Scaffold this active site. Structure first.
Site, PDB file in Angstrom:
ATOM      1  N   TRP A   1     -18.070  45.264  20.354  1.00 24.12           N
ATOM      2  CA  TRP A   1     -17.204  46.142  19.355  1.00 24.12           C
ATOM      3  C   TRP A   1     -18.209  46.457  18.271  1.00 24.12           C
ATOM      4  O   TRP A   1     -18.971  45.518  17.930  1.00 24.12           O
ATOM      5  CB  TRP A   1     -16.228  45.353  18.929  1.00 24.12           C
ATOM      6  CG  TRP A   1     -16.168  44.151  18.036  1.00 24.12           C
ATOM      7  CD1 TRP A   1     -16.427  44.163  16.793  1.00 24.12           C
ATOM      8  CD2 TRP A   1     -15.921  42.591  18.374  1.00 24.12           C
ATOM      9  NE1 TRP A   1     -16.637  43.058  16.242  1.00 24.12           N
ATOM     10  CE2 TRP A   1     -16.420  41.924  17.328  1.00 24.12           C
ATOM     11  CE3 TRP A   1     -15.537  42.120  19.458  1.00 24.12           C
ATOM     12  CZ2 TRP A   1     -15.927  40.535  17.242  1.00 24.12           C
ATOM     13  CZ3 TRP A   1     -15.504  40.777  19.680  1.00 24.12           C
ATOM     14  CH2 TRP A   1     -15.700  40.031  18.362  1.00 24.12           C
TER      15      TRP A   1
ATOM     16  N   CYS B   1     -20.527  39.039  24.089  1.00 20.32           N
ATOM     17  CA  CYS B   1     -19.397  39.636  23.107  1.00 20.32           C
ATOM     18  C   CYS B   1     -19.893  39.708  21.634  1.00 20.32           C
ATOM     19  O   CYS B   1     -20.647  38.522  21.408  1.00 20.32           O
ATOM     20  CB  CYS B   1     -17.909  39.251  23.322  1.00 20.32           C
ATOM     21  SG  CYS B   1     -18.001  37.308  23.108  1.00 20.32           S
TER      22      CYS B   1
ATOM     23  N   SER C   1     -10.228  39.237  18.992  1.00 16.91           N
ATOM     24  CA  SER C   1     -10.385  38.366  20.188  1.00 16.91           C
ATOM     25  C   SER C   1      -9.606  37.161  20.139  1.00 16.91           C
ATOM     26  O   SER C   1      -9.398  36.615  18.852  1.00 16.91           O
ATOM     27  CB  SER C   1     -11.595  38.180  20.567  1.00 16.91           C
ATOM     28  OG  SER C   1     -12.268  37.394  19.427  1.00 16.91           O
TER      29      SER C   1
ATOM     30  N   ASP D   1     -17.646  42.323  26.068  1.00 17.74           N
ATOM     31  CA  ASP D   1     -16.498  42.692  25.138  1.00 17.74           C
ATOM     32  C   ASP D   1     -16.928  42.968  23.630  1.00 17.74           C
ATOM     33  O   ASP D   1     -16.625  42.218  22.738  1.00 17.74           O
ATOM     34  CB  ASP D   1     -15.509  41.222  25.074  1.00 17.74           C
ATOM     35  CG  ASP D   1     -14.192  41.433  24.695  1.00 17.74           C
ATOM     36  OD1 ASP D   1     -13.116  41.785  25.380  1.00 17.74           O
ATOM     37  OD2 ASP D   1     -14.065  41.357  23.253  1.00 17.74           O
TER      38      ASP D   1
END
Ligand SMILES: Cc1cc2nc3c(=O)[nH]c(=O)nc-3n(C[C@H](O)[C@H](O)[C@H](O)COP(=O)(O)OP(=O)(O)OC[C@H]3O[C@@H](n4cnc5c(N)ncnc54)[C@H](O)[C@@H]3O)c2cc1C
Ligand SMILES: Cc1cc2nc3c(=O)[nH]c(=O)nc-3n(C[C@H](O)[C@H](O)[C@H](O)COP(=O)(O)O)c2cc1C
Length: 613
Positions: free
Chosen positions: A612, A565, A392, A610
């Site tokens: 992960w 995120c 990011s 966002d």
């Protein structure tokens, strides 16, 4: 030439396995299925669906004893992959009829998302509705647990099914056909020999715009530092110079890097294999009428192949071990390697606890099995490609655009194999010295990816930012974007940060930066959830619940946008549950209605993820 049924007619092949891969797993699965088709008296190849239109499924039945197989994945909210988008929208817009065609569908997905093999189910149902015929049940392949297990079971149950449906024999066993052949080169200048380039020849020397995944741009690492004050984990910050590269990006986007593998690993692999790593060569597909000329672009040396073009760090798949079994001299090791690719039995659990759980790479499997010296070209044949790693962006476009920023955690762990296992890209960038000075630059290839994680169009909209760990990078981009907006004259609404860390003196990210941000009014309220200092554990969702009284009013009146995120294992789910509780208790509103309200919020883009893992 463009149509592939004519290529079937010329090559005499009948079975096709399509792949919708982006990270390589579906491509490898389709290649394995096409190779395995030879074991049952049939012949076929795996073809990418992007360069071939799907209207040829009408001509597909014209081949006797034919079949087509689909191995597709999905991303986002059930969205197609880049190569499979044309297939998806052709399926959406098609109205032709496919009578007498035979198909099978294998689905790739993750249990953690709602659209769990959305594309596989969609393709199967659309083919059934359109008038095609099913043969074998859909493969519910989930990446949450093990994905190779599901595919191996589906294949072991599917090949006998199609074998009995078509009446062909299966006498041939352990054929293990090759897909590429070695071509050595003795006198060849380095002008036309690849030395790490991904796309065009000699791209890394004289680059031209534009720059993307196929043609990355080598940035110059201006500076880097160890953000965290502790030493257990190396939380690092990168700054990549993007000067004169024409790359235009935005805050919250994704920067992707093409790593270079460890030189010690390649040297040790070459030493244990006993081969000349500096031999210019090539691997040529036997099937001439195939778009996959070489597994990696060639000509190139062994050293370049194992450094920049191969993946020698992650555990190998079962097919690699099965194809390497016959090179084991000792009968017991050969039997272990053969049974490692089974569907059940003690060998299955041995694979589970020895290759994936223990995180044993190719070098580890070579060292622990000394009676195994496969040829270097076969190992380069079997091993998968090296995948780019994405981070990011911690910078902003309306602020310094000449350089992007990266917040990363250095990967380092004690694998159960007893060997120090090191991450590829994180440690590769960690070793990237800032240098500068006269001519040292420590170049790093990269390209940018657009995404929907963006700030609101109007600065008056409040923003709620929640994410622990290294998730602060897009949040920092947003923060300095808002600071720039405030310093530019335009007023900016409330900006909230909800961050988490273990200890303030261990891994607190950018103490000084957020301190000055709060002291200048850019960040209206900072909220940090320490995770290890106090006796209990207080996480970010606790702070969300405690600020519920302000948060509910903010969402109702200001139309505040929510950004989350970080890791998706537990954090996103508990943040969602806390938001459900807050929006339902302060409604008052029921659980189902609150869930519907949150989904309606996402549909408008006021809720973004966002994550992960
Ligand atoms: C959309 C997206 C955004 C991302 N953004 C960021 C970001 O902002 N910052 C960032 O730092 N990363 C980010 N990542 C992760 C990044 O892309 C890499 O996955 C990460 O840096 C892993 O390090 P590596 O590149 O060396 O990978 P690898 O060398 O492949 O190492 C990761 C592998 O090792 C395994 N592994 C790691 N630690 C352990 C352990 N202790 N025990 C067992 N197995 C372990 C992992 O499961 C995985 O298989 C993002 C990923 C995606 C997909
Ligand atoms: C960013 C991202 C988004 C994903 N989205 C979905 C999804 O929407 N539905 C799903 O079933 N799986 C999803 N997955 C899981 C992948 O389908 C799974 O990892 C699969 O093995 C990838 O196949 P590939 O290597 O061919 O790309 C996603 C994975 C990632 C990394």
């Amino acid at each position: 030439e463009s149509s592939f049924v004519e290529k079937m007619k010329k090559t005499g092949r009948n079975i096709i396995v399509f792949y919708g891969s982006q990270t390589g797993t579906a491509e490898e699965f389709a290649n394995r299925l096409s190779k395995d088709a030879h074991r049952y008296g049939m012949r076929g190849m795996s073809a990418d669906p992007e360069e071939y239109d799907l209207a040829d499924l009408s001509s597909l039945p014209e081949i006797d004893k034919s079949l087509v197989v689909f191995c597709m994945a999905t991303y986002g909210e059930g969205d197609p992959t880049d190569n499979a988008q044309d297939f998806y929208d052709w399926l959406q817009e098609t109205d032709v009829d496919l009578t007498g065609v035979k198909f099978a569908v294998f689905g790739l997905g993750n249990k953690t998302y709602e659209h769990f093999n959305a594309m596989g189910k969609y393709v199967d149902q659309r083919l059934e509705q359109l008038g095609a015929q099913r043969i074998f049940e859909l493969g519910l392949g989930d990446d949450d647990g093990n994905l190779e297990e599901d595919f191996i079971t589906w294949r072991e149950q599917f090949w006998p099914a199609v074998c009995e449906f078509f009446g062909v024999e299966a006498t041939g066993e352990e054929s293990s056909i090759r897909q590429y052949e070695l071509v050595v080169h003795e006198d060849m200048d380095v002008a036309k020999v690849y030395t790490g380039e991904m796309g065009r020849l000699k791209s890394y020397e004289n680059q031209k715009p534009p720059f993307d995944a196929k043609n990355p741009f080598l940035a110059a690492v201006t500076a880097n530092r160890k953000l965290n004050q502790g030493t257990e984990r190396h939380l690092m910050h990168l700054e990549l110079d993007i000067s004169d590269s024409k790359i235009r990006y935005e805050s919250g986007d994704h920067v992707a890097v093409y790593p270079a593998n460890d030189s010690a690993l390649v040297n040790q692999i070459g030493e244990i294999l006993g081969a000349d790593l500096d031999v210019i060569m090539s691997l040529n597909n036997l099937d001439e009428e195939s778009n996959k000329k070489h597994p990696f672009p060639c000509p190139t040396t062994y050293r370049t192949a194992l450094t920049y073009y191969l993946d020698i760090t992650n555990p190998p798949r079962t097919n690699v071990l099965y194809e390497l079994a016959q090179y084991a001299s000792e009968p017991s090791e050969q039997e272990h390697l053969h049974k490692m690719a089974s569907s059940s039995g003690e060998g299955k659990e041995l694979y589970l606890s020895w290759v994936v759980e223990a995180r044993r790479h190719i070098l580890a499997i070579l060292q622990d099995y000394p009676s195994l010296r496969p040829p270097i070209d076969h190992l380069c044949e079997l091993l998968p490609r090296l995948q780019a790693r994405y981070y990011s962006i911690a910078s902003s476009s309306k602020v310094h655009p000449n350089s992007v920023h990266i917040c990363a955690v250095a990967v380092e762990y004690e694998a159960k194999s007893g060997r120090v296992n090191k991450g590829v890209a994180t440690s590769w960038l960690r070793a990237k010295e800032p240098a500068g000075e006269n001519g040292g630059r420590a170049l790093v290839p990269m390209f940018v990816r657009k995404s929907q994680f963006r700030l609101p169009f109007k600065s008056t909209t409040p923003v709620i930012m929640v994410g622990p760990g290294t998730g602060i990078a897009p949040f920092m981009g947003f923060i300095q974007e808002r600071a720039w907006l405030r310093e530019q004259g335009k007023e900016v609404g409330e900006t909230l940060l909800y961050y988490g860390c273990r200890r303030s003196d261990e891994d607190y990210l950018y103490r000084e930066e957020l301190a000055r941000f709060h002291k200048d009014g850019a960040l209206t309220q900072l909220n940090v959830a320490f995770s290890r200092e106090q006796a209990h554990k207080v996480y970010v969702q606790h702070l969300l619940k405690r600020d519920r009284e302000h948060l509910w009013k903010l969402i109702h009146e200001g139309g505040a946008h929510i950004y989350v995120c970080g890791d998706a294992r537990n954090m996103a789910k508990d943040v969602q549950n806390t938001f459900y509780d807050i929006v339902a208790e302060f409604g008052p509103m029921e659980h189902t209605q609150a869930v519907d309200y949150v989904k309606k919020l996402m549909t408008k883009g006021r809720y973004s993820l966002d994550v992960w893992s």
